[PDB]
């Protein structure tokens, strides 16, 4: 768990060197993008349940997975699916605020593949659900904030696949 | 000479990071590591300077 600042400090410390001009430029880049990160995080905190339910309405609804036999069939499985998608959106917001995806592979992508493979959860359908969540939130917060959200959404989909 | 550098290094890291904890968790127990070594008020007026 480290943001862009802590990773820059960790690189300069593992070097043992002081903060040179490249580290200063990286921190200036983060300190310019931080206000946009803050406003996108507020806008995403506004519409958590709406983004999640629009992602299910785009991908998972009216398909086979909500029908009998699907892994999203029962009300318990539906509630756990909404819980999993809320987790993905919340941690993508955290990784957007930090500017570093270390929290994603520390706390989402750690044992997620083995959990989903033990439960029988389809990984492709949940990857499509995360992609639709990314599409909806990029329609919500704009072009560049949607892109800096979608880089961590693509990180979650890549670590899941 | 290395330590008079190093105090400034973690001062700079604390200034960028926004929390002085990086200074705190290092130079708290530092005193009895270097008390057999050297003069401690010399280090104090060094950091003040």
């Amino acid at each position: 768990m480290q943001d862009a600042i802590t990773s820059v400090i960790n690189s300069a410390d593992v070097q043992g060197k002081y903060l040179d001009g490249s580290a200063m430029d990286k921190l200036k880049a983060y300190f310019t993008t931080g206000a946009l990160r803050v406003r996108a995080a507020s806008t995403i905190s506004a519409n958590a349940a709406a983004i999640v339910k629009e992602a299910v309405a785009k991908s998972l609804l009216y398909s086979d997975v909500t029908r009998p036999g699907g892994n999203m069939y029962t009300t318990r499985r539906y509630a756990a699916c909404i819980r999993d998608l809320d987790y993905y959106l919340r941690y993508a917001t955290y990784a957007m605020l930090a500017g570093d995806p270390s929290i994603l592979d520390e706390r989402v992508l750690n044992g997620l593949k083995e959990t989903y493979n033990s439960l029988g959860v389809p990984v492709g359908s949940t990857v499509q659900a995360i992609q639709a969540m990314k599409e909806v939130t990029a329609g919500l917060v704009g072009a560049d904030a949607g892109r800096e959200m979608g880089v961590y959404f693509d990180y979650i989909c890549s670590g899941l696949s | 000479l290395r330590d008079m550098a190093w105090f400034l290094r973690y001062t700079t890291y604390a200034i960028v990071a926004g929390d002085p904890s990086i200074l705190v968790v290092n130079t708290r127990g530092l005193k009895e590591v270097i008390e057999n070594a050297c003069s401690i008020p010399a280090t104090i007026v060094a950091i003040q300077e």
Partner: peptide
């Protein structure tokens, strides 16, 4: 950005700070 400005100022002139410390102490 102000914290970076003062950090870059401290880094760019750390040698003379350490040298001033050196003839303050020894």
């Amino acid at each position: 950005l102000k914290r970076l400005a003062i950090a870059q100022a401290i880094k760019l002139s750390s040698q003379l700070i350490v040298s001033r410390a050196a003839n303050r102490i020894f």
